[PDB]
Amino acid sequence: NFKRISYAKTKTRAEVRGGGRKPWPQKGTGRARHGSIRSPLWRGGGVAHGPRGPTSYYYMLPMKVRALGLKVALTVKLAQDDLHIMDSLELPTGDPQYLTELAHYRRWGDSVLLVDLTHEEMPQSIVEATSRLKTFNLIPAVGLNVHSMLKHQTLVLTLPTVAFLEDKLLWQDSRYRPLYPFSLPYSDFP
Amino acid sequence: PLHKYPVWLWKRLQLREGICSRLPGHYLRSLEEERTPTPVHYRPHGAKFKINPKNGQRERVEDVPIPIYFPPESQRGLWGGEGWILGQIYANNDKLSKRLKKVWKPQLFEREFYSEILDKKFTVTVTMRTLDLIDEAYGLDFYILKTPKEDLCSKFGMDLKRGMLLRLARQDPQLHPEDPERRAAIYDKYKEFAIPEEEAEWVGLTLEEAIEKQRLLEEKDPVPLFKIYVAELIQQLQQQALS
Amino acid sequence: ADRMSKWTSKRGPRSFRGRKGRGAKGIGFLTSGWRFVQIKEMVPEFVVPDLTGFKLKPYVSYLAPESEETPLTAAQLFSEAVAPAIEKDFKDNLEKYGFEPTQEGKLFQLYPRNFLR
Amino acid sequence: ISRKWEKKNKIVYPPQLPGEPRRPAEIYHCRRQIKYSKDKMWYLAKLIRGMSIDQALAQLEFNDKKGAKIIKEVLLEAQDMAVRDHNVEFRSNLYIAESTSGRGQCLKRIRYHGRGRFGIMEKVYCHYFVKLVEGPPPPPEPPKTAVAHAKEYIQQLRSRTIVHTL
Amino acid sequence: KKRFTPPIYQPKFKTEKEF
Amino acid sequence: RGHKGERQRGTRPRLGFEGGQTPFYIRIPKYGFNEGHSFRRQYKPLSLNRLQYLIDLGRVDPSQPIDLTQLVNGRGVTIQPLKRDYGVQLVEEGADTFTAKVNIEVQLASELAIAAIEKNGGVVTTAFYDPRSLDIVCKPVPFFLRGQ
Amino acid sequence: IGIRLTLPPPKVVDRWNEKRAMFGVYDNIGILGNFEKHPKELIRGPIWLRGWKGNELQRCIRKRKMVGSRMFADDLHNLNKRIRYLYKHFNRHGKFR
Amino acid sequence: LTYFSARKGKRKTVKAVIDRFLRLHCGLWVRRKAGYKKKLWKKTPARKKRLREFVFCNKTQSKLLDKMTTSFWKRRNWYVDDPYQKYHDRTNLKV
RNA sequence: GCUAAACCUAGCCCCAAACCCCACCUUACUACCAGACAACCUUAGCCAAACCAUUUACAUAAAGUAUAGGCGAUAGAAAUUGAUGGCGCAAUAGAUAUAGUACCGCAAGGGAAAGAUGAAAAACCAAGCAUAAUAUAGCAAGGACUAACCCCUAUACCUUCUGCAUAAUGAAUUAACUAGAAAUAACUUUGCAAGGAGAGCCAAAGCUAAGACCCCCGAAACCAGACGAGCUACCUAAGAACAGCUAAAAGAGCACACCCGUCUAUGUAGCAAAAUAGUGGGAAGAUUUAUAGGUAGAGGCGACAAACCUACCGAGCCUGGUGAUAGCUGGUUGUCCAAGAUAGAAUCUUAGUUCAACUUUAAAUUUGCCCACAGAACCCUCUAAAUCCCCUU
RNA sequence: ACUGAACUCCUCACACCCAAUUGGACCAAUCUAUCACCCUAUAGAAGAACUAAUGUUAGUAUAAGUAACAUGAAAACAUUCU
RNA sequence: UCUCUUACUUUUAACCAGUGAAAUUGACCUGCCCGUGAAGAGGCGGGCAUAACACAGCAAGACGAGAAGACCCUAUGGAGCUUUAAUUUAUUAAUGCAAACACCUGCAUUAAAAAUUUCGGUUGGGGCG
Ligand SMILES: Nc1nc2c(ncn2[C@@H]2O[C@H](COP(=O)(O)OP(=O)(O)OP(=O)(O)O)[C@@H](O)[C@H]2O)c(=O)[nH]1
Ligand SMILES: [Mg+2]
Ligand SMILES: [Mg+2]
Ligand SMILES: [Mg+2]
Ligand SMILES: [Mg+2]
Ligand SMILES: [Mg+2]
Ligand SMILES: [Mg+2]
Ligand SMILES: [Mg+2]
Ligand SMILES: [Mg+2]
Ligand SMILES: [Mg+2]
Ligand SMILES: [Mg+2]
Ligand SMILES: [Mg+2]
Ligand SMILES: [Mg+2]
Ligand SMILES: [Mg+2]
Ligand SMILES: [Mg+2]
Ligand SMILES: [Mg+2]
Ligand SMILES: [Mg+2]
Ligand SMILES: [Mg+2]
Ligand SMILES: [Mg+2]
Ligand SMILES: [Mg+2]
Ligand SMILES: [Mg+2]
Ligand SMILES: [Mg+2]
Ligand SMILES: [Mg+2]
Ligand SMILES: [Mg+2]
Ligand SMILES: [Mg+2]
Ligand SMILES: [Mg+2]
Ligand SMILES: [Mg+2]
Ligand SMILES: [Mg+2]
Ligand SMILES: [Mg+2]
Ligand SMILES: [Mg+2]
Ligand SMILES: [Mg+2]
Ligand SMILES: [Mg+2]
Ligand SMILES: [Mg+2]
Ligand SMILES: [Mg+2]
Ligand SMILES: [Mg+2]
Ligand SMILES: [Mg+2]
Ligand SMILES: [Mg+2]
Ligand SMILES: [Mg+2]
Ligand SMILES: [Mg+2]
Ligand SMILES: [Mg+2]
Ligand SMILES: [Mg+2]
């Protein structure tokens, strides 16, 4: 939701074209009273309570809550036997068929989320293998997220990614309350 | 949708694009600069900070200029930054009474002035403030040359400034002919205001006048392509003969 | 009450109908008594040539070669008309070669054009 | 718009077995967008409903309503097509099983009234439908006699049960 | 005061329609 | 929404309006309860109990001079210069059980707090900080990033 | 009769296109990247409501403040009128007061 | 009051409340009695003593003042020497 | 089985990015003659203040703070800080748009509707009716019954009200459209915890995040800027008409044309948004009338009838502020359960509102109701049903 | 003596009869995320539900086949006549 | 005109043919008497009456259609007009004082013309009291 920006808008009776004059006098015509042909009652009139402008649904959960959610996702995968640790993502070949066959043989799910430490250093073989696949998605460690972890049936991690996630998520525990945004220099925070 | 640029930058963009681009740099900078006019109809604050008596605290104070309306007749005369104050007042000077539209107009006098540089007598509708400014400057020529545009507030004043500056730049012999000593004395007296004739020409020109001047400067009847092709062919034949 | 129909000389009172025309170019002027004086020089004189012996029929034989279109340009005209004389006199005052400094004094001034078609 | 009446003539039945009664021929005809009110056409349709083709034509030839001529033309066309295409042996051996008038597509016009007011006219159009069935017209339902009426009453009496008990 | 409500004419296009 | 009246029409009078009777919040005489509130100096209290707790947990190191920067870094106090806070005031609370020997610099200090600090062998000095310097000292890193 | 007489054309949704497959990636850019980038910086949309939320009146005020000078003439007039109406409604109408 | 300001979209404070009442952080509002400076010559000493006193407000009046003032006025203020410092919190209060 | 039903894409909405031959100012769309004439000048008002008169808004954080303010409604800083499409519409929707066209208005200006085959055309369902009119009696149904009716029971709905079958409002009917927006403070659920929060802010268990409450249509009005004197009021220019008879140079008489509109009848959705027939006043004059021009709304014009100013002038019309405002009327759309009718005070206030009282929800705690003696005033000679208080129960 | 309620008992089951207002449990359809794959589920959203506003647009009724409207006569359809 | 109305012609009318509206309409299977009741019943209670439908008249009722009554009251709703209602003189006209050497400008005072706004409540309906 927080990324959501609904671009739905409707013209209110003030924004609908025309509708300035009174359609007919109050009294004597024998018809209902009206003040403009663009009120919500009229065909082609305004919308009383419609979507208004681009609306943002942005809100931020506490970073502690989000880190705890990542932790809970990892625990759920491990407990349900969907988590698989790897020494490295290097493949013998870049053929997507090899990766699909390996996943099927090892009884992984129809969808696999492979995670590597950093984007730049991801092996060329796995890059080629996962670029051509739809249900096998390769992401950097920084890109791990609960939504993708839940969407993908199995989660494949490397040892460096495991260490990275452990450090990052455990820091939230035992960190002070911030004095200023952590992007700014701190005595011990990289 | 949204315009790429804010509407208030459209004038600057037009300046940057077109013949305004070909306008000389110094004139464009003079147009761009917007130095605030000298206070005339309000008393400026002494300092940037003031100890407000209500709570005895130091608070920043800003000088908000009173809007001044300059009628077109003013551009034909020399009003010392003085104009019509179009505002409102409270009857009997109490805010709980009625509010009324009030126009304060300056007292205009018809006076004759002599310009040493122009050696001409000008009859000009003037204000007592302008007379005081002239006295302070020690002459109409000094007042015109010292006063910037934003304080002079007169197209006629800026035209006088352009004429004086042009004569100073050219050292025109037309100033008191058959009197070189007097002409040199006048030019030496007003020497400090001398500027290059190129800038003096564009001093005090409105945007439309500058556009017209640039158009007249750069208007050239198209050269017949006969001459261009003849020159090109002659050059080519010269190259062939040489080599 | 009709605004979408073209304004013509057929609409309006006698004065309007008489005053408005249909685009025909004027031939003369009006003098006292509404007498029309027609100026002969203002009447377009059709300069019709002698077609006797002319061999160009309106249509062209379909058995004709097709050639690429080469629109004439000022450079091409200069090369084909003036360049030879320029070369000859350079090997051996542009009015001699053909340049005319001013269109004034000519019956057919190129600009501003003062001839029909 | 719907045009099922025209299609009703395109149904083809399977061949009848020799030991089966001969199926009477049925011919569906209609005329669309008649400049006539359906309410007025209904009276003519009811008049000729259930009669033989000849009797219907005879009545229509001497009825003064405008729709009478249109219905007569439709009936004549129906007879011609029944003989030519539907294998009806005799012209006269046809009777009007169905005859109804349907609303057509109407046009709206303005009627000017006395004080700048107006009404919405309707240029009324109507459809006309006929089914012609081969064979003599079915005999009119005879009025129920006193004997049958008393028989019905006695049957009603006999049908009585002891209501609201075991 | 005299009360008069001017008649309102419905648009002509509604009644001018043709097949 | 109710039935007719202003409430159903959604046009009931403003808050504090009493139907035309002189409102309660206007019939009470004005008194200078909050005059100059935005100019009154405020000092966050730092009880000796809090200081001893911080020292015991190691969030404030008593082996080095203790000042506002060290307190803020240890999160022992939260200063809001924009909210007219002028620093930290020592408070006698916890004086009886205070035992740490510390060199602490504060803005205000009670007599009993000073007595406890000095009895435990420490040193206490009251130092003034105008709002700009107070903000800088409380959050030095943002100031250093300002480049001034 | 406001019901269609035929089934609508089948709607096939590719649950594993690139957008859905990589949705949510880098939502934890901050906590997993030393907080160099805030997750709100991943929001692409109108400049005046990137990483910000509010009611209609607040949104209109923000739009006028941030892009009002770049708005078209009639759009800006409509925005001013909408701000006026929303102010009146929120500050003078409602069940609670 | 102004529930949404036209310039910030925030809730505004009725400055009459600020000028007339004092809010104790505990949630109590202190006020001066009306008429404590009026016609003192015709008021008995007991009445003058009653009028010269600082007084609390009803629950409903306190709620009204809380609604009419923003959250800034309900913060914790550590003034240097506040005569009402001790009154900012309740002690031995049951329900 | 007819009217008809449906349909998917024409397009549109919000963002991002990005800056965008000839004729025609005279009567516009008119080939071709002495000009001179040239632009700038505070918005107002509605509305809120429950009237109205000063007044009333037109990145983040500081902060709704300093200040302003019939010090009241409300208004409101700065220093300082640092800054790549769609949980959009899909022909009553979305642009008004198939089009600013048709049409309407003198003009400004207002302003629509709609189309659906296929790869190739060089191939069953709304209302309304008909099938098929009707049988004693009755909110049209229910209990039923062998049986449609007959038997018995049953005073449409909505709104409004003390109370409606009410002979109080609305509704012919079908389809589509058509009306609860949100802060403070609380409650619930997470996270962290004397700290919380992704600077600012709060904090004496708080802080952070989320969830969850605030409608639609309707005036006469006011102000600003345009458009209007082809009707009408008056005027300007230069024109035209007035037979015949009596009288005689006439604001003369009878009387046509012509102008008007006294009285009657008809008409009253009319032939007509002021007419027809008869009757009648004037008809050489202060007459009638064709053409062109002029006076414009804080105004014009007026033989003052508050007349007339493009059919509706106590002050035109159009557009805009404007979704003006309305304590007033009307409406306020799924199912189901539960609690729920309570004194008064103040108020330019009694058609409303705020506070009380009642009511609802959740939470904490312990007494709540009923009520035994004893007890609660003389004035007053007598003087009621009762009440208050009140352990037990 | 009997008749006689929705009172009470009887067999079974029970949240299942007060306007304004208030609390709660469900929920039609739509879109989105995952499911599902002859019509769905768990959630997130919202232009989210119409027997009623002399409501707006469109269709068709009722009034009603009613009120109203029209073409002088004959004839060879030349023409004549009133 | 009427006592006192009659006769006839035309139009209208009714019938046949063509074309073809309007307001109105909750649904109606649409009776009378008495009583009741939201204080005048087709619909309720007690009686009476009662096969079914057309066509032409009539106007006693459907508190009939029509115009959200123009009478009356209310609204802290309007507007027009008058003032000797409150607030003003922005604007003109005068003066006086300055300014400048009559005009113009600024400040006052007085008139003329106007402009903005209001016209309390209770009330045996409103008004008067
Ligand atoms: N949000 C948004 N993105 C747009 C819009 N128009 C184009 N884009 C994006 O522009 C990108 C490039 O568009 P293309 O049409 O593929 O290429 P292009 O023509 O070079 O694009 P432009 O340079 O933007 O014109 C894509 O990511 C589009 O989604 C628009 O209106 N809104
Ligand atoms: Mg509008
Ligand atoms: Mg209106
Ligand atoms: Mg629309
Ligand atoms: Mg007419
Ligand atoms: Mg009809
Ligand atoms: Mg209501
Ligand atoms: Mg009420
Ligand atoms: Mg008001
Ligand atoms: Mg109000
Ligand atoms: Mg700033
Ligand atoms: Mg449309
Ligand atoms: Mg049907
Ligand atoms: Mg009735
Ligand atoms: Mg009724
Ligand atoms: Mg009523
Ligand atoms: Mg009705
Ligand atoms: Mg005229
Ligand atoms: Mg005569
Ligand atoms: Mg006469
Ligand atoms: Mg009079
Ligand atoms: Mg009168
Ligand atoms: Mg008019
Ligand atoms: Mg309203
Ligand atoms: Mg209950
Ligand atoms: Mg009062
Ligand atoms: Mg019983
Ligand atoms: Mg769902
Ligand atoms: Mg809706
Ligand atoms: Mg419906
Ligand atoms: Mg309706
Ligand atoms: Mg009919
Ligand atoms: Mg009839
Ligand atoms: Mg008739
Ligand atoms: Mg007929
Ligand atoms: Mg009765
Ligand atoms: Mg009858
Ligand atoms: Mg009557
Ligand atoms: Mg009636
Ligand atoms: Mg009424
Ligand atoms: Mg009023």
**DSSP letters for A74-94:** HHHHHHTT-EEEES----S--
- Conformational region of residue C64, where left means phi above 0, alpha means psi within -120 to 50, and beta covers everything else: beta
CATH superfamily of D1-166: Ribosomal protein L22/L17 (3.90.470.10)
Query: For residue D119, which phi and psi values (nearest 5 degrees)?
Result: -130, 165
Closest-CA residue of C relative to B237 is C87
Give the CB-side neighbour count of residue C110, counting CA atoms within 13 A: 6
Mutate which: G16, G28, G37, G60, vs A, most A CBs within 10 A: G28
- What distance in Å separates the CA atoms of residue B196 and residue B194, rounded to the nearest whole number? 7
**F147 conformational bin, left if phi > 0, alpha if psi -120 to 50, beta if neither:** left
| Inter-chain CB pairs, F–H, below 8 Å | 67
Pairing of strands H22-23, H29-32: antiparallel
Alpha-helical (H) ranges within chain D are: 4-7, 38-48, 53-62, 66-84, 146-158
* Burial category of G53 from C-beta neighbours within 10 Å (exposed 0-12, middle 13-18, buried 19 and up): middle
Give the torsion through C-alpha atoms of D8, D13, D19, D21, to 10 deg.
0
Tokens of G69: 């000078």
- Identify the CA nearest to D55 among candidates D101, D92, D97, D98: D92
Q: Which residue of H1, H2, H3 to mutate against G (max G Cβ within 10 Å)?
A: H3
* B20 in Cβ contact with B206 (< 8 Å): no
**How is residue C13 written in tokens?**
């009172």
Q: How is residue G32 written in tokens?
A: 């997993």
Tell me, in Å, the resolution of the deposited structure.
Answer: 2.6
Find how far residue A34's CA is from the centre of its chain.
47
For residue D113, give every residue at least 6 positions away whose Cβ sits within 8 Å of its Cβ, in sequence order, or none.
D119
Distance in angstroms: CA B242, C1' I306: 105
- A86-124 burial: b if 16+ Cβ within 10 Å, else e: eeebebeebebeebbeebeeeebeebbbbbbbeeeebee
Tell me the C-alpha distance between F69 and F137, whole Å: 6
Instruction: Tell me the chain G residues in contact with residue H2 when contact means C-beta distances shorter than 8 Å.
Output: 91
Tokens of B2: 């949204």
E1 CA distance to ligand 21 middle (Å): 17
Backbone phi and psi for residue A121, each to the nearest 5 degrees, phi listed first: -90, 5
User: Chain C contacts of B237, Cβ < 8 Å?
Assistant: 86-87, 90
How far apart (Å, rounded) are the C-alpha atoms in residues B130 and B78? 7
Interchain contact, G70 vs B8, CB within 8 Å: no
What six digits make up the tokens of G85?
């109406």
> What gap in Å lies between CA B143 and CA B134, rounded to an integer?
5
Give yes or no for a contact between F138 and F104, defined as CB atoms under 8 angstroms apart.
no
HSE-up of H24 (CA within 13 Å, CB side)? 18
Q: Who contacts B125 (Cβ-Cβ below 8 Å, separation ≥6)?
A: B73, B76, B77, B78, B79, B108, B109, B110, B111
Q: How far is CA F88 from CA C86, F106, G85, in A?
A: 99, 6, 48
Using alpha carbons, select from B108, B40, B46 the residue that is nearest to residue B71.
B108
Cross-strand pairs, B78 = B126
D1 CB contact with strand K at below 7 Å: no
Which numeric CATH code is attached to A1-190?
3.40.1370.10
Across the strands, what pairs with F123? F103
**Three-class secondary structure of residue F8 per DSSP:** helix
Q: Do the chains F and H touch each other, judged by at least 3 C-beta pairs below 8 angstroms?
A: yes
> Strand, coil or helix: what is F1?
coil
Per the structure block, which two tokens stand in for F40? Answer: 């009154």
Amino acid whose CA is nearest the C1' of I7? G4
Spatial distance between the Cα atoms of B163 and G73, rounded to a whole number of angstroms: 43
Give the end-to-end CA distance of chain B in Å, rounded to a whole number. 63
Instruction: Identify whether B106 is preceded by a cis peptide bond (ω within 30 of 0).
Output: no
Q: Which amino acid is at G92?
A: R
**Residue G9 backbone dihedrals phi, psi, to 5 degrees:** -55, 140
Domain boundaries, chain D: 1-166
Q: Please indicate whether chains G and H are in contact, defined as at least 3 beta carbon pairs under 8 Å.
A: yes
Q: Which residue of G has its CA nearest to B8?
A: G69
Which ligand lies nearest to the CA atom of residue A43 in the structure? 4
How is chain G split into domains, by residue range?
1-96
Q: Which helix (H) or strand (E) holds H87?
A: none
Size of interface B-C (CB pairs under 8 A): 29
Residues of chain H with Cβ-Cβ distance to G54 below 8 Å are: 9
Q: Please list the alpha-helical segments (H only) found in chain B.
A: 10-16, 19-22, 25-32, 72-75, 128-137, 140-146, 149-152, 155-170, 180-189, 197-202, 207-218, 225-242
- What CA–CA distances, in Å, run from B216 to B19, B211, B220, C37, G86? 11, 9, 9, 44, 55
Spell out which residues of chain C touch residue B225, defining contact as CB-CB under 8 Å.
74-75, 78
| A48 CA: distance to closest CA in chain E (Å) | 27
User: In a 3-state reduction of DSSP, which class is residue B69?
Assistant: strand
B155 with B42: CB under 8 angstroms?
no
Q: Check F28 against H21: CB less than 8 A apart.
A: yes
Q: How far apart are CA D143 and CA D129, in angstroms?
A: 29
For residues D64 and D25, the answer to whether their CB atoms sit within 8 Å is no
Q: Please, which chains are in contact with D (at least 3 CB pairs closer than 8 A)?
A: E
| Contact present, F114 and F122 (Cβ < 8 Å) | no
Neighbours of ion ligand 4 (CB under 5 A): A 44
B113: buried, middle or exposed (CB in 10 Å: 19+, 13-18, 0-12)?
buried
Per-position DSSP letters for A26-60, written without gaps between them: SSSS-S---S-TTSTTSTT---TT---SSEE----
CA distance A130 to A139: 10
What is the spatial distance between Cα A83 and Cα B84, in angstroms, rounded to a whole number? 82
Residue among G21, G35, G63 whose CB faces A183 most closely: G35
DSSP string, chain G: --S-SSPPPP----TTSHHHHTTTTTTTTTTTTTTSS-GGGG--S-GGGTT----HHHHHHHHHHHHGGGB-HHHHHHHHHHHHHHHHHHHH-SS--
Q: Is D141 helix (H, G, I), strand (E, B) or coil?
A: coil
Q: Kindly compute the dihedral angle of the four CA atoms of residues B3, B5, B9, B10, in this order, to the nearest 10 degrees.
A: -50
Q: Is B10 helix (H, G, I), strand (E, B) or coil?
A: helix
| C-alpha span between G94 and F111 (Å, rounded) | 56
**In this structure, what token pair is assigned to residue B188?**
């030496």
Chain center to CA of F54: 18
According to DSSP, the residues that pair with C58 across neighbouring strands are none
CB-CB under 8 Å, A165 with G32? yes
| Phi and psi, residue D33, nearest 5° | 60, 55
Between CA G34 and CA A118 the distance in angstroms is 13
Q: How was this structure determined?
A: cryo-EM
Q: How are the residues of chain D apportioned to helix, strand and coil, as percentages rounded to the nearest 5?
A: 35, 25, 40
Task: Please list the alpha-helical segments (H only) found in D53-160.
Answer: 53-62, 66-84, 146-158
- C58: which 2 tokens? 């309106």
DSSP state of A143: G
Whole-angstrom Cα distance, residue B180 to residue B186?
Answer: 10
DSSP D22: P
| Rg of chain A, C-alpha, whole Å | 28
CB B162 within 8 A of CB B204: yes
Q: What is the dihedral of CA G19, G21, G23, G27, to 10 degrees?
A: -140
Q: Which residue has the tokens 């104070």?
A: B61
CA D72 to chain centre: 13
- Give the total residue count for chain F: 148
Distance, CA of B18 to CA of B32 (rounded, Å): 16
Q: Which value, in Å, is the radius of gyration of the alpha carbons in chain E?
A: 14
Q: What distance in Å separates the CA atoms of residue F36 and residue H79, rounded to the nearest whole number?
A: 11
In the chain, the amino acid numbered B163 is: G
Phi/psi for F105 (5° steps) reads -115, 125
Nearest to A149 by CA among G78, B172, G24: G24
- Whether the CB-CB separation of F102 and F66 falls below 8 Å is answered with yes
Residue of chain A whose alpha carbon sits nearest to that of G79: A15
Q: Tell me how many degrees the CA angle G36-G40-G45 measures, rounded to the nearest 5.
A: 130
- Measure the CA–CA gap between G91 and H4, rounded to whole angstroms: 7
Q: What tokens appear for B50 in the block?
A: 């003031």
Query: Is the CB of H7 inside 8 Å of chain G's CB atoms?
Result: yes
Ligand 9 center to residue B53 CA distance, Å? 36
F141 touches chain A (CB under 8 A): yes
Looking up tokens 């911030």 gives A178
Q: Are B183 and B168 in contact (CB under 8 A)?
A: no
The H or E element that residue D33 is part of is strand D26-34
Those residues whose C-beta lies under 8 Å from the C-beta of residue B65, and which sit 6 or more positions away, are B36, B37, B39, B42
What is the H or E stretch that residue F131 is in?
helix F131-138
- Assess whether chains D and F touch, using the rule of 3 or more C-beta pairs within 8 angstroms: no
Q: How many Å separate Cα G89 from the centre of its chain?
A: 22
Residue A60's Cβ-side half-sphere holds a number of Cα atoms within 13 Å equal to 16
Judged by its nearest atom, the ligand closest to the C-alpha of residue F1 is 7
Nearest to F37 by CA among H21, H3, H5: H21
> D107 vs E6: CB contact, 8 Å cut-off?
no
The residues pairing with A139 across neighbouring beta strands, listed in sequence order, are: A115
Residue D110 structure tokens: 């303005």
For chain G, list the contacting chains (3+ Cβ pairs, <8 Å): A, B, F, H
Burial (CB < 10 A; 0-12, 13-18, 19+), residue D64, is exposed
**CA dihedral of residues B12, B14, B20, B25 (deg, nearest 10):** 20
With b meaning 16 or more CB within 10 Å and e meaning fewer, what string describes G13-23? Answer: eeebeeeebbe
Structure tokens at D90: 């005799």
> Which of B112, B161, B171 has the alpha carbon at shortest distance from B141?
B161
- CA diameter of chain C: 78
User: Which three-class secondary structure state does DSSP give residue B147?
Assistant: coil
G93 touches chain F (CB under 8 A): yes
Is residue B61 within 8 A of residue B43, CB to CB? The reply is no
